[PDB]
Write a protein that binds this ligand. Sequence first.
Ligand SMILES: Cc1c(N)nc(C2CC2)nc1Cl
Ligand SMILES: [Mg+2]
Ligand SMILES: [Zn+2]
Length: 325
Amino acid sequence: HMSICTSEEWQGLMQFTLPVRLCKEIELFHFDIGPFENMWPGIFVYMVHRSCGTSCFELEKLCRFIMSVKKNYRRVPYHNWKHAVTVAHCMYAILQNNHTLFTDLERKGLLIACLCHDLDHRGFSNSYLQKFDHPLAALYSTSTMEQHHFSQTVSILQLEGHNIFSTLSSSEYEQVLEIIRKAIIATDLALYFGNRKQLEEMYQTGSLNLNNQSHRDRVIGLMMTACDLCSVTKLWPVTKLTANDIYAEFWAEGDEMKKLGIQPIPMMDRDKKDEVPQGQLGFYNAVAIPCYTTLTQILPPTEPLLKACRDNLSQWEKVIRGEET
Ligand SMILES: Cc1c(N)nc(C2CC2)nc1Cl
Ligand SMILES: [Mg+2]
Ligand SMILES: [Zn+2]
């Protein structure tokens, strides 16, 4: 079952107003929510109200939904409430800059999918769950955690007073749940490689057509990867601090494996931290740079993400060369 927020929590959120000085900052792709922890639920309400409107959702239901989602993120080093709001902010910046390409249903579904995309993450990878035959891997054979995050999103919507989508027609309700399911499953990095390869081929051959639902689904999937990996698009000190959290979580998985008698892969071994800069250079070359390159080709307003990713790749190269630590 899903944890539920308290009345004090959602009522407090209903009263929040964003300081006007932050309006200019929140619109920027490089915005880092880090320094504003108490404002994170309020920043999410602000982004939903800007993209979709103050009357898109019943305010009481939206505040209960957000505070219950926060309560169902766990105290893990990386896949936590901060990550959820960071990914939702990147989606907000992408949607704001490509507004007319997305329907009202898609913008509301994608912001909610981003806030919920790692719901109830336990700090263990799909690799761990599958290798050790965890019951989640029996229920969900592929994209294990992602299917769980979607099931948890539906469970929160089913809590009394939390169904923010109940006012949609029956056809739009089904459509928004499908947008959310596909977007959350797209955050499984195993699916990204094939998705990006298909999109690059569609773009290069001139067959990419945003009026085609299957092509829209793929573009949305790439947008979800771009948002999920957006710590690589922040200013260097922020990118480096988030990388410490990414590895702290993977090292705890590696420690658990060692206790269970299985040697972890080097990335998850805290005794192999010296290999992190080369691991990051590999991740940027194989995953991040191609992701933002293809995204910028399809959605030119997203170019700042690619520029920042390239800047951070250069910083990791400087670390390898001993110019930075
Ligand atoms: C964003 C992100 C991510 N999801 N996973 C990694 C693995 C340690 C390589 N690095 C980054 Cl930078
Ligand atoms: Mg995830
Ligand atoms: Zn994530």
